[PDB]
Structures are given as structure tokens and as C-alpha cells.
Amino acid sequence: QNHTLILGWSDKLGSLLNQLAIANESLGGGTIAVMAERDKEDMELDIGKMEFDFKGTSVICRSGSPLILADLKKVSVSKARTIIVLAEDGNADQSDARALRTVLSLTGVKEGLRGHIVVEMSDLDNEVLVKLVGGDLVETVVAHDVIGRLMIQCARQPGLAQIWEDILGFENCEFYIKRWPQLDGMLFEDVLISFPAAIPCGIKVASYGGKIILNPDDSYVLQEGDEVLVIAEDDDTYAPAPLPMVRRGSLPKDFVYPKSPERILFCGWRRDMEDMITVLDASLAPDSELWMFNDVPEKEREKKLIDGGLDISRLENISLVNREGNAVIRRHLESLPLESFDSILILADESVEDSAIQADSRSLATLLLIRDIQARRLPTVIISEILDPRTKNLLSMSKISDYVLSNELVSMALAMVAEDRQINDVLEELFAEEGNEMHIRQADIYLREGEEMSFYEIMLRARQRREILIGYRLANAERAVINPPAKTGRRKWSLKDVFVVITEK
Amino acid sequence: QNHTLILGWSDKLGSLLNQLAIANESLGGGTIAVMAERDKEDMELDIGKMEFDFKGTSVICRSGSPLILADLKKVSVSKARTIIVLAEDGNADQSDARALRTVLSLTGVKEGLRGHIVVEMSDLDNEVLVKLVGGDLVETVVAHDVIGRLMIQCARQPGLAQIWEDILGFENCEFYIKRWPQLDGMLFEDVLISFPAAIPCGIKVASYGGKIILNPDDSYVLQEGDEVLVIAEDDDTYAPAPLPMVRRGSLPKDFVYPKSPERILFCGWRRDMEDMITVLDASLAPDSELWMFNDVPEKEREKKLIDGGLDISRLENISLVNREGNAVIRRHLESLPLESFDSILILADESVEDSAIQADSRSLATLLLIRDIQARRLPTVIISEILDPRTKNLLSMSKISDYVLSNELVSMALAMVAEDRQINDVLEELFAEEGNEMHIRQADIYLREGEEMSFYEIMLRARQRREILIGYRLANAERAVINPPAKTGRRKWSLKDVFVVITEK
Amino acid sequence: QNHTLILGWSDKLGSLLNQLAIANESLGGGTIAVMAERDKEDMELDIGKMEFDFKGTSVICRSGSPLILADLKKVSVSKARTIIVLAEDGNADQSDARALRTVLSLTGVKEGLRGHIVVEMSDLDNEVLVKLVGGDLVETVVAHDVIGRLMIQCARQPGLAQIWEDILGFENCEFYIKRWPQLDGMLFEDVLISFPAAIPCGIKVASYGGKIILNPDDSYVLQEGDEVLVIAEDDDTYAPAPLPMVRRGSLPKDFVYPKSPERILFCGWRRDMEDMITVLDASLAPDSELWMFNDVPEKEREKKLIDGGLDISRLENISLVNREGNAVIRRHLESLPLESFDSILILADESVEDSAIQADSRSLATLLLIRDIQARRLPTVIISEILDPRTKNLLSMSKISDYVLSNELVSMALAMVAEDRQINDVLEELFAEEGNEMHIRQADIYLREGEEMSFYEIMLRARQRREILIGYRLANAERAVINPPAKTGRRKWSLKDVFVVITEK
Amino acid sequence: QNHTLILGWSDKLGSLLNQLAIANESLGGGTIAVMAERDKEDMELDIGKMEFDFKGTSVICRSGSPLILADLKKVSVSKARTIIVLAEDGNADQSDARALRTVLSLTGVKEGLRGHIVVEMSDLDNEVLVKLVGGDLVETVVAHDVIGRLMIQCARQPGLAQIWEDILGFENCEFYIKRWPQLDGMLFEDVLISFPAAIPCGIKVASYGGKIILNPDDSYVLQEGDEVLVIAEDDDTYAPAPLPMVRRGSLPKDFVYPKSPERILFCGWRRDMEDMITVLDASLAPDSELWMFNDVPEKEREKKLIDGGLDISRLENISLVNREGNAVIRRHLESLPLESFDSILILADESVEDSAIQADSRSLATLLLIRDIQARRLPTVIISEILDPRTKNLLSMSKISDYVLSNELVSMALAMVAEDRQINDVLEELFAEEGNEMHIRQADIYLREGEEMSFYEIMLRARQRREILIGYRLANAERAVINPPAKTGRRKWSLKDVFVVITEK
Ligand SMILES: [Ca+2]
Ligand SMILES: [Ca+2]
Ligand SMILES: [Ca+2]
Ligand SMILES: [Ca+2]
Ligand SMILES: [Ca+2]
Ligand SMILES: [Ca+2]
Ligand SMILES: [Ca+2]
Ligand SMILES: [Ca+2]
Ligand SMILES: [Ca+2]
Ligand SMILES: [Ca+2]
Ligand SMILES: [Ca+2]
Ligand SMILES: [Ca+2]
Ligand SMILES: [Mg+2]
Ligand SMILES: [Mg+2]
Ligand SMILES: [Mg+2]
Ligand SMILES: [Mg+2]
Ligand code: NA
Ligand code: NA
Ligand code: NA
Ligand code: NA
Ligand code: NA
Ligand code: NA
Ligand code: NA
Ligand code: NA
């Protein structure tokens, strides 16, 4: 049957269905079964009111428990190509307890499983046990942790928010892995310029057991069994072609500039916030500052952090500044040096996160107050976490939409890993402080003002600093272009254009 | 279709339906659609048991969510003349979060909206964001704040309670705005006496973009496009006629008397009570006193007030007296100087307001205790907030009814703004400490004992102190008369009669 | 229609239905309508499973709200002979808030009411307001307060528990009021011996507006319009007959003995316990002691009591001893001088009373522990409050049943007042510390050992100390006999027999 | 009808049904009726999805309350051979309050009961009252207390977990009591070797009123009316046969070795944990240590223990070590000397036990952390309580299953006592610190290396130290064998084999 099976119901279900409909469109549609502990007719009513285009995909609803074998047989569990275990809205530990029981149930199916299991985990501290009992069958996506990592990346580089939304979801372009036997024996530097409609980003190396190497050496020779990781519009839109003519040349300003210290504000005590502090300490330049404004009394913050595994005495790049107060109280916020922050993250506080409507209401209240306080005392990225994707969609015609990062990104990550389990490791590396990551780079590293050259020519210059050039944003364009369709044609570039690369630190 | 659409269900729904039925009666009835997340047959059952006269208006019920476009299409959202977003019973922040999502949903309707959106807001701190995203489509009515303002006005002038109930609801007379081209070129002083069945109160000034000027200058000349604001019995009961014969004369006692200080008691810590203290400080004579009797420890009251934006060190007219105690405990209440207060407001405490039945039970318990304590220690307006309009209606044949102000006034305000969005600014001014307000004035300012004159003659005398005379209450009458039908006939007035005016401070 | 209408559903409903079925049996049955906010078919199912004999009474169920006039019309509210407003299980203030709204609704019925309204009140502090708005239509029975008073009476006189159960319910004999014109002009002392099958206890005095005088003067002459209060088996079982021959004689030992001090234990902090302490202080001999064992810290008990209106510095007969502890913890209980108490009351603690199953579980746990502690440290009335009548009935074949007093007594009181509203004042007096009350008296006051005399002869001796003799308990009988059928026959009495009287203090 | 009647519904129902199906299989099936306060069709749906073999037993579902006689008649309460009162999931006191009311209801059935009542009690402190009112009809199984006792036994002797699971459930072998008149007059030492397919363990002694004597004297002569207690595969698989030929011989090493002190860790504050500490103090060698790691502040632990009846100053064999911390926080756990414990019990904490899914999630989190901490600091039985049997079953293909003891054992105990009420006393003795218990013993007490002998010959040697030999575990076998089928055949034993005995201390 090779359908997608979704176990559960949550605020993320509609956005996940939308992603899978987009992924299936190139096939003419596919089949999705949803099984939840709800009345089947109510499920069908809700699905029938969803406002996106199903693009030929059929959605079937069944009522039942993932712990009951007779219920799993109702949705042909052993023939699904992927099984997605959706987290329950509300308390993270309760959702993760259900996830563990569900994975154990699925591993007990005696006919076996045709596909893999994608588990939406709500708390990092519960991931190891799920991975232990799920073995080779399971991929975990820790929703809470991924969102924290993306918020930090987008706070540090404004403009990555749009890029990450584009790449993590199936609209526009995204990562695909495919085997191309006709490229066996070619150097990676030539593979890079072999696809009119794709940008190679890595190689699945057969001699390493299928490990994906992002940003490999230009001198790597593709071997039998290797596969290519690309960014492309869809799984079927790209193919290798004869090598184009690409002039070679040197980087004008191949410089590493001293990184300046950053001052970041976190509003709210997020569950497991020590994990975000760890990521930030590994990401910022020395002498940076993290301010934490929240209602936890200062004298007890250290215990929370040390109990979460963070030794603040051994932070390398950041100093911590603690301020106590209520993030929806104007008087408390205005005591902060709001104008001095390079970025401000408004986080879902652990005291209210179990209710998405309450958490999101507080986050938007804080956003409005920070903006209004600053406007009123006239003579900085602000990013606000939104837990319900519906609220993000409802904000989409407002200016507010530019200031929010939502759990829709979790639905996108789940759909990516459902469609190819191997992409989970690629995303993990790009979300991690180690290895490769995405960066937005000024044009004067790569070219001179008005220089006439092709995207491929810039790409080959970028290889001289070990970067994969994946896109650009033109000086007065609203949106970056990833995997630009016109790669061989020459244009006149501006020093105000910017380039999007995958790069090591 | 031009129907009224109500989104939601609450304790206020019946009283709102009643108001709209009264407003529609002059048309022979209209149509109201109610959509809520309830079983349609249960909604219909409840509507069919409501005890007021529908007066030809038809009520249609549908089950659905205001965030779901297919549900909005079921109630012809794009053809409604007004959409009313009713607050949810219970927690104010949760209700306001729903309100914001609903306004965003309505603004997303791609066919557009024929009418305006009236949003019942539960907390003033959430109003700005709703106004920002709703733009030109939205009128907000902040129920909690309006009730606080009305309680203060009625505590300061006993007898305004009946007047405000009469004017804010569609029974008796109320505000209407209409264009009268035949009055172009006339002075406002002549417009004032041009309507046998109405009292002009202001002008919608076309050259100010349609801003309504309450109580304009007698010398203002009506221009093309201007409209007249009147108080009248219904939208169609009044029209201009030839100018009547009105004797002119002077005010006998056009004096401004020194205002005496007032001592006011607030029982209970109302949510956002600092907003009421602000209004009171701007309303009372110097050297006045506000006593706050409630269970919040004295040492922490200042923080609550400063966090709500109130700087008590810069109050101009009132001193604050703090007493700690439980407002349903006789022993605590009897320590207060109950006999010395000019007025006592029994407020819904923020600790119980999320349950209307609990809050109203405490308010009535306090009312009875205050009266009984005073009666028992024999050898003052008391106003009690009631959150459920049903309880106010059930009290209507009891003496208790004279001591209660209820959320029925919110239903009336919502219906007024639903019927003409421009009235929201008029009500805002009359509820505000700035600009014009209603006052009850002694007769000896305007006439001598037994003087024989017409209502119009008194009105023209009142213009000499920049007042609009809107009604009277005769010396031994139970009720004031607003917009009295007999305006040209002479009667013999008593110095014990009183006059109702709109006036600046 | 003249039916009984019950508004509500609670744990007391079955026992109330049983009482009304017993009261109606002499008519051949009657009709009871029950209206509650429940599914009608579920109500009917529950009624059809009740295990007592309906004795010809028909029970009709309807679904609806007592605040909705259309629902009240469904149960013919204006034709009912009595309307009983049953308290809701759980929180007392919420139940009383519903009661107030229901009384207001009933007073608004424009066709008027044929009968009276009996309101089950849960908290004494809410009674005055209900009485104020209900006027002449309402009788209140404050369930919580009545049970406290009965527990004190039964703790002080073991054997009154069975007597009160017999008299307050319709099994056996109970109070009836009826007019007997043929007794006009007779002295009360002769009325007393005029009814073979009843005992006159008082007179409804027409010249006092129908006030019932319990235990009147023997010389009172019945006037036209007066009615007789009797104890009898049923409303129709008794009638006056020619005066019997009754020998007169003197009391052998008409002595008042010095009352000895009592030591009483209250286990648990009962809601409004100050009301019980007040009753006890007025009931006990000087130098008595009340021990209060409960978990409220000693330092804060005084505030609870003074806030409830009790001035402990002005207690007349009791001293208070405070002990802190948990009444289900053996170690805490065994620190008490359990063997030294004249009686122990195990009260439903205010911390758990909102759940009858939890409260009753704690009360029975305490009962078992007190008995077991005493038995284990070998080399006193114990009375336990039970909130659910079903639990009392389930205990009825156990020895435990002798140690429990339950809310079934509330159902009995409600049925008594439903059947004749005038009985509420009689019960109030007998439950009150003022006026008349029931007492169990030793035989040697009235007769000598082996004296051969009739019940009537003893009754006339008892009149010489202003007592109404209503029954006896023979030396080795399990049960007292009230209104004994054989009143003229002589028997040989024992000084070990006891007599039941109504008497002033 | 002689069916089994189960009153209630809980997480244990499926495992109880499975046990009863196994017990009934030898009859070809039987009948089980389940009555709960649930929709009958939902009950039937759930039963129809259970995944074990019903083995010919029919399950009938009815909706109803055990307190309602009409409902009890629907399931033929008076003809059932056993009635099982299943505890409610969640709060123990509420479940036990229901149990008491249900037992009272059953004792009120006027047709009487054919069988006995098995009551699942959740808290030991509530057992005495249930036993008092249930009299001769009731057997109580205190689930919480039994699980604590089994966890201690299995922590002290690894390998008893599998043995107890085998013997307490109906798979494999278990205890049976039956009368064998042909054995009257035989000595117990000969009865012991009379059953090819069973091991006699005790005698039901008719002259003691039917008291079961476990491990009687070899010289006891069976009398008329006595019955034999055996371990056998099923009730019908065993019978006496002529005495086999059994060589006699002496024990090689009949030594009592000095018992070494043990160090035990309890993680979590279990409800009524003092009861486990009492059992442990009576079970361990002198100078043993109990460490209690949990979040209760040290200064208040003593009160909890003394209020539960434990005098820590008079412990005989253990010292208590108190550590404060959170059992799911790695940093707190790693401060413990984890490597030094002879056994670690992870207990369901009283703060979360009312939710089985939360409690079990914490227990598994602690298990994983303890194992991972130890593995990570490289250059001991661990037993975890699981409250939901479904979770234990879901873990059954994981290694984790070896580390869990679950409430499935409660279902097994309930089924054992349902099938023969007399087994409750046998289990009580084996679970008690007094009398006989099961022990795993080294082979060199009984035989020499390579000695060729039969199981019966070893059994008769074991009688010389007053032990009943019930099974063995061979040196490299995964599982012990209880009641081995091949008892007369000789094999060559290893000093690495172990023997399972019933023995006094
Ligand atoms: Ca595709
Ligand atoms: Ca965590
Ligand atoms: Ca795409
Ligand atoms: Ca109208
Ligand atoms: Ca506010
Ligand atoms: Ca009107
Ligand atoms: Ca009768
Ligand atoms: Ca009270
Ligand atoms: Ca009777
Ligand atoms: Ca069997
Ligand atoms: Ca306990
Ligand atoms: Ca077996
Ligand atoms: Mg962690
Ligand atoms: Mg504010
Ligand atoms: Mg009181
Ligand atoms: Mg105990
Ligand atoms: Na994409
Ligand atoms: Na990375
Ligand atoms: Na009006
Ligand atoms: Na104003
Ligand atoms: Na009676
Ligand atoms: Na009395
Ligand atoms: Na077994
Ligand atoms: Na034992």
C-alpha cells in the first residue's frame, strides 16, 4: 500500500498534511491514513474543512489506539511506507510517554514494518530511551529542541528565517538524495556544476556505510554505490548534463574578519533553556552577553541550570546577565536596555507552554510591548516563538508575521524525515553547532562591484574557501533565491547583493 | 443579506439578542445568525426558550468555528451588515486570545466584508493589538473597562444609573446620527430647537473627516455633508420642523459652586483596578479619599498598582486608604466607617471573576452585610457589580435591583456599536474623564420657583453655560425623562425638579 | 394538580422520594415531579432502580432548568402544592447561589404559586438573603446547621438518635397540626388526654396569628380557630374521644439534680464550627470542656472563630482545649484522653466536605481508629457525620450503623416541611437551645418501683413539672416507643424504664 | 451459573481476564461477567480487541453499579462462584472507599451469595474495616502492599522474579489444594514423594479447622478430612502413585553461613513506605543499610515514618541513610554510590502514583539514568515498579523487561484467590517475613560435583534441613524449572546448579 500513516491528532496535523500533499504532488497524489482516539466522523469533518489544496492526495480517517494491534491492522500498519507518531498537544512528558508506548507497540507488530517510524519527541531528556527501544526502525525529531536551535540561528542572521522555511518545507526547493551511476568516477568539483536544476551539497558515501558527508572535498572521486545530496525543486526535476563552461578566477577579499561580540536577550524561562544556552555559547564570539529576563528568582536560576547539565562557570564565550520580571508588564520590560540588543528571542515560558493559546498570547503581548516601549522613548532581530501553526497562518497578512517562528517548522521537519529518513542526519548537522551550517555572506568576499559573471562562476570561487554556494539575495529583493534556475548566464552583480552558503565555522 | 452575525455564545447572548430585536422592530424585524462551537439543536432549544419578544426578528443557529472559512461561509460572513465577536465566559486573557484569532480570521476572508466587526474585549491591556491587526474593520468595546467607568459615574451621581440604562439600550431613547440636507446653512443653536421629537447633541463634521463633535458651538454653521447627532426614540421617529417660538432669558444663578471632597469605598481588588483609580483621581474634587478594602496584603498593593501603570505619588485629587479584610466577613466590614462614605462600590474580585456565579454571590453577600451592619448599629450610593445579566433580571422585582449594575450594559453597548459604528466614539467621550459627560443639575441654576416656561426655553438658558439639556426628573417622579415629548408647552417648574445635561467640566 | 415538585438532583433525592411516598401512602399515593438538568431517560432509569416501595406514588421526570419559565411550565409549577429546591452536591456556596437564583425565578412566575417553596440551604450565612427575597413563599431548612444541632443533642443524650429518626421521618409517628372544632372551650390539660391515638404537644393559637405554642399552660382554653399539634402515626389515624378515667397523684421525686460537667471531643474542623460551639456553650453545665482535635494550627484557630462571630472570651459554660493533628493517623489520636470523653463527634472536615465519598471515608476511618486504640490499651457516645444517605443505608446491617448520623435526616426534615410548612417552626424550637426540647428522664422522678399505673397517669404526673410525656423506653427494650398505642391500661413499671418528654430547661 | 463476576474496570482487567481464561482452560472454558459504569457497547468493543487467547471462556459485559441491586441481578450476583471487586485506577483512598461500599452492597444481597468476594485493596490502612464488615464472605488482596513485598524479595534474590511470576500466575505450575482419601494414614515424608506430577508443600489440617500448614513435619500422619497443598501444572494433571525407590543419604555441607550485610537503595517516596522499611528490617542481616533517595526534605521524613507507625530508633538490622534529590535528574543520581548497592528499587513516588502513565515514565527514566551514569564512569539487582500491566507487556521484547516488576502480579494474585480462597493464606505466609519463604540455594549444600542422583533424592536430602525442594535452575539455563516433570531419573549435577526451596528462616 506504501501510504503514509499518521498516529495521533494535534495542532500540527493540518500543516503536516499540507506538507505531505506538496511532496506527493509530483506523483499525482498519494494516500495518507490518520488514526486517532477520536470519533471517525468528527475527524472526517475536520479534514474536510482544511483550507489547503490536497493536490490529489487522499486522506482516510480511522478511530483507534496505536497500542491496539486490531486498530493498527485497520490502517494497514505493516504496509505503510512511513509511520509518523505525532506528539500530543499539552504536557511534554505525557506526550513523550505516549510516544514510547507507541514505538514499543509498533516494534511488536509481528508481520514487521515496510517503512520507518518518525517520532515527534517533545523533550530531549526522553529521546535516548525511545531511540534505544526503537532500534533501526526509528527516527526521532525533538520538536522543542529543533525550534530552539532554529530560533538561535535566525536571531543571529536575519534572513535565515525565510531561507529555513523555504528549505525545510516542500514548497520551493529542498534536500534530495539520489543515486546517479553515470557520475561514478567523477570528481565532486565537477559533480557540483553537473545539474542545471540542482545544487549538489554532499555525498552519501557507500564505503562509510552510507554516511552523508556534507560539503566534501572537491577532490573526492565518486565510487560505485555513492549517492548525491542536492537542493532541488522536487525529486524528479533535476538530472546531470554535460559540464558547462565556467571561468575560473580568484576571490578578491578572502578574509576572515574578527567576529564582533553580540548581546542577546531571552524573554521567558523556556523548558530546558540550558540546552539553548549551550548552543549559544558555542555559537557567539568571545565577550558576548546573554541576558535572561524572566520571573524565576535569580538566586534559584543556577540550580535549574546545573540540574539541566550546564556548568555556567565553564562557559567560554558568553557572560550571563539575569533580570527578574514579568514579560507582559510594560514597567518591567522598560527597565531593560532594549535598544542595545542584537537580537531578542521571546520564548514560550515553561509555566504556560502546556496551553498553546495562552503561551502564544503572552508571546505576542511581549512583542507588542517591546516595540511600543522603544517607539515611545525616541526623542535588532525580534523573534517570537509561536506554538500553534494556525496562529502563525492567521498572522500571515500582518506585519507581525515577520517576527514569529512557529511549530509549522516542526511539521516540515517531520515531513522531510518521513519522505527520506536519511535527511534527519543532514538536518541534524545543519542545526548543530558542529560541522557545516548556513551563512549569509557579503558579496565583496567573492566579486567586485559591477563584475559580470554567472552563478556557477561565483560558486567555483566560493569553493576556494570551502563553501557550497546555494543561493543569493539581490540588493533590493524581498526574498532570497535558493537553487537559482539560471546558473550559466552572466549578470552584473552588486556589492549590496548577498550570498547564501553552506560552510564550516 | 445584511443580517447581524454573532460569533460565540455567552451569558450576555440573550440580552444582546433582545437589544437587536428592539433595534430591528421599526423595520418589522430583521435576521440574526449565531454561530458557536455547540450542537446546533442545543442552540436552537436554548434560543426557543428565551423569554423576551423577538419582535419579528428571526434567529438562525449554526455550529462552527470562526477560524474555519467553511464555517464562516455557512453564516454568509461576507454579506453581514455587522459581525459581533462575543467574549467567552470565564478567563479574560483566554477570551481575548480567541478574539484576536477571530479578528485575524475575519480579516482573511478574501471576498471581503460588507460591514464592520464589533469585538467584545475583556481586558484593556489586550485592546491595542486587536485594533492594530483589525485596522479599519474593527470597533472594540472593552467590557470590563466600560463597566468600571459606568460604576464610577453612577456612584458619583445617583440617578445616572437609570439614565445610562435608558440611553445605552434601545428601549426608550438613544443616540442616532443622520444627514439632513435641508439643515445645511443653519446655525447649531437653531438646529437644537428644530426637532419636535429629538434633541440634537452634536454634529458629524464632514470637513474633519466625519469626526463627531459633541456639544458644538451655537455659532457653528452646518455644511454640506455634515450629519446631526440626536437623542431620539427610534431611527425613524424624528424630523426637522419650522422653528418654534422660544422666549429668551437669562440664567438666575449661573454659579460654579466649590466642589466638595468625596469619600469613596471600593470593596474587592478588581482586575486592573488601577484603571478605575486613574479615572477617579481625574473625577473627584481635591482632598477626596479612596478607601480600598480587600484581601491583598497592604505591603504588596503598591507593586500591583505600579505594575499596572499607576504612580500613586502623583495622584492629584485623592488620597488612598488601605484596609485588609474579607468582604463577606461581617466582623471585617464593621471595622469600616461605612456611614461616612458618599458611595460604596462592591467590585467583582479578580480572585473569583472567572466564575460569574461565585463573583455575583460574593457581591450580593457583601451588599446585604453592609446594609445590615449599618441598620444594627443605629441607636450613600451602594453599587454592586453583577457579571451575569440573568441574575440582574432575576433581581428585577426585588428592592435589591436598585443596588446593582450588570453586564447587561455591555450587551447594550455592543448592540449600539453594532447598529452604528460611529456611536463608539460618542460613548467613549461620555465615558471618559475628558470632554463632555452627563450631569444631573439642580433647578435653581436655570429657573425660579414656580416659573412657567417650556422645556425649549430652559434648553436655551442652559446653552448660556455651554450645556445641552437632554431631560429632567420631576420632584416626585420615580424616573427621569430623556428627550421629553412635550417641548414647546409651558409648565410650572419646581426648584426640587432636576435637569439632565451634557456638559464639559 | 397539587403534586410535589422537586427541583434538582442530589445524593438525598432517593431518601426524599421515600419519605414523600410514605407520607402519601394514606391517600393511596400521590404525584411527584422531578426536574433536573439531566437527560430525562437517564433520570427515569435511575428512579426505576430505586429500592424502596413507592406505595402508589407516581414519579415523573423532566429535563430542564428552574430559571427557565418554559421548563417550569413543563412541570406545572403554578399548580404544585409544594416546591422543594434540593441542594446540589458539593460546594456549599455554589449550591446556595443556585438556590437564591431559583427562589428568584419561582417568585417571578406570573401566574403565582399554589403552594410554598422549601429551600435546602447549605450554609447558614446565606439564609437571610434567601428569606428576604422569598418573602411569604419560602421556608428554609439549613441542612448543615440542622445536622450540627442534631449531632449535639444525640451526643448529649444517647437514645435520642433513634427517637429523632423516628419523629423526623414519616415511618412510625410524627407531628401533625389539625383543627378540631369540637374541642373549642376545652382546657389544654383535658385536650392532652382526649386522643386515644395521639399525644397533643402544642396549640396553634389563632389570636397570635397562628403561632404554635409548644407545651402550653394546662389552663389554656382552646378558642375558635385554634388548632392542635399532636404526635400521631399518620394524618388520619387519630381523633378525640370522651375523656378517660385517669387517677391523679403526686411526683415521688420532683427534684432538680445538679447537672454534671461534660467533656466533649470534636474531631475535624467543620465548616462554620463556631455555630456548633455556640450551641454547645448554651447546652452544657458549667465547668464543661470542649476539645477540638483537627489539623488547623492552634495559633490561627481564634481568628477563624472570631470571624465566624464567636467571642471565646465570653463563653459561659465551656473551656476550649485545642489539639493539632490528623484524625486518620493512629499516632495522633492515641495522644488524646479518649476514655475520658462523655461523647465524641466525628465531623466532616471543611477541607473534604465537598466530596461526600472522601469525607465519609475519613469519618469511618476515624471511628474505627478511636475504637481500636481504646480496645488495644485495655490492661461514651461516638457519633459520626455521614454526608451520603446511601452510605448510611449500606451500613444498616452492620454494628457501625449505631455510630452514624446522616444527611438522610435532612431529607426527612425537607419532607416534613414540604408536607406542612408550619412544622418548620416547631422543629426550629426543638433544635434550638431556647424553649422546649426533648429529654430522656429516669423513671424514679415519676413513679416508685413496681407501681401499677397507665401511661396517661404518668403523663398527668409529668404535667406537674411542665413536661409533655411523649413516650418511654422499657428497661430491656432495644427501641423507645413514641405515642404508645396503649395509653389507658395499667402496667407495672420499673425504675429502670425511662421516659421521653418535651420540656423547657 | 457458577461464573466469575468482575465488578469494575481498570488497567488490570485484561491481565485478570487472561489469568482466568488460563485457569478455565482445563474445563474447556467458563464464563466471566464484567459489570462496570461504562457503556456496554464500548466495553464489548474493548474486550473484543484484547490480544490474548480466551481459550474457550466467554466474556459477557453489562453496564451498571455494584451498589444497585437491580444491576447486580443483571449479572446473577447470587449465583457467581466468585465476585472480584477490582480497584479503580487513580487515587487509592477513593478506590478503597468504593470497595467498602461495594462490599456492603454485596453483603446486603438477600438471596445470599454462592461464592466468596475477592477485594482488591489499594491501601493497607483501609483493609481492617473492609474485613470487619465483609466477615466470612471476603478475602482482601492489598495490591500496593503485595507489590512492595515482592519487590523486596526479588531485590534480595535475583531469580526469584521469574519464579514468582511463574508460580503466582496460571501459566506453568501453581498451588492447588485437594483431598486425597487414599493418603489417609500416610506420613507426610511419604506423601512428599507420592505424586509424579506434583510437589506437596503443605497440609490443610482438618483438626485445626482447615488451617494450612506449610512445610509440615515429616512425621505428620494425614487424618481423615486433611487435604494436600501441592505445586502442579493444573488442577487435574496430578495424582498419587506407588512410592518410588529413593536412595537416602546425608547432606555434604549442611552449614549455616554468616549472612552478610546488604546495602539497598530505595528511589522515590512510595506511599506507606514505612511498611516496606519494616519488612526490610526483618529481612536483612545486621549492620545492613537502607538508603532513601527522594525529594522529601530530610528534616520532615521522620514525621512521615512515625505517623505511619515506624519507630526508627528501634530498628534492629538496618541503618537509614537519607539523601534528598530528584530521581529523574542525572546530576542528583550521580552523587549516589550507585556501584555499591546490592540492589536498587525504583518505586512509584506517592506524588505521581495516581497517574500510572506519569509514574511509569519516571520509573523508566530513572532506570535508564542509573544504568547510563554507571556506564559513563567506568575508567546489583535493579527492580522498577510499573503500575500499568500494558506497559510491562509492551516492554516484553526489550532487555528493559528484566528490570521491571508490574501490577500484572496483582492480577495474578487476584485470580489465584478467586479460584481458591484458601490460597490467600498461603500467599500471605510466603510474602510475610514470618514463617516459610522461597529461597534460592547453592548446590554444594546438597550434593558433590558430578554426583549422579534424582530430583527426589535431592528432595529427601533437603528435608534434613527442613526445606521443601520445589525446583532448580541449571548452571547455564535461562529459566528455573519448578515442579520438574522428571523426578525419578538420575542426572549428573553441577555445583553451579541452584535449587529452589520453601524454608523457614
Ligand atoms: Ca515529490
Ligand atoms: Ca527536560
Ligand atoms: Ca519543492
Ligand atoms: Ca430601529
Ligand atoms: Ca490587565
Ligand atoms: Ca428606542
Ligand atoms: Ca399521610
Ligand atoms: Ca459559612
Ligand atoms: Ca407515620
Ligand atoms: Ca484449570
Ligand atoms: Ca496509607
Ligand atoms: Ca498452570
Ligand atoms: Mg537535558
Ligand atoms: Mg493596563
Ligand atoms: Mg456565620
Ligand atoms: Mg499504615
Ligand atoms: Na522547500
Ligand atoms: Na552545524
Ligand atoms: Na434607549
Ligand atoms: Na467625558
Ligand atoms: Na415518624
Ligand atoms: Na429548644
Ligand atoms: Na503458574
Ligand atoms: Na514468610
Numbering used by the authors:
A (entry chain A), B (entry chain A), C (entry chain A), D (entry chain A): 320 to 698, 727 to 852
Sentences from the paper on this structure:
Two DMI1 homologs, named POLLUX and CASTOR, were identified in L. japonicus and both of them are required to initiate symbiosis. To address these fundamental issues that define the primary function of these channels and their role in the symbiotic process, we performed functional characterization of the LjCASTOR channel and demonstrate that it functions as a Ca2+-regulated Ca2+ channel rather than as a K+ channel as previously proposed. Our high-resolution structure reveals multiple Ca2+-binding sites in the RCK gating ring and provides structural insights into Ca2+-regulated gating of CASTOR.
The CASTOR soluble domain was crystallized in the presence of Na+, Ca2+, and Mg2+, and its high-resolution structure allowed us to identify multiple bound ions clustered in two locations within each subunit. The protein crystals had a space group of I4 and contained one subunit per asymmetric unit; four crystallographic symmetry-related subunits assembled into a tetramer with the molecular fourfold coinciding with the crystallographic tetrad. Cluster I contains two bound ions and is located in the cleft between the two N-lobes. The other ion is defined as Ca2+ and is labeled as the Ca(I) site; it is coordinated by eight oxygen atoms including multiple negatively charged carboxylates, and it has ion–ligand distances of 2.4–2.5 Å, both of which are commonly seen for Ca2+ binding in proteins. The Ca2+ binding at the Ca(I) site mediates extensive interactions between the two N-lobes that lock them in a fixed position relative to each other. Cluster II sites are located in the cleft between the N- and C-terminal subdomains of RCK1 and contain three bound ions. The anomalous signals indicate that only two of the bound ions are Ca2+, labeled as Ca(II) and Ca(III) sites, respectively. The location of the two Ca2+ sites indicates that Ca2+ binding provides two tethering points between the N-lobe of RCK1 and the periphery C-terminal subdomains.
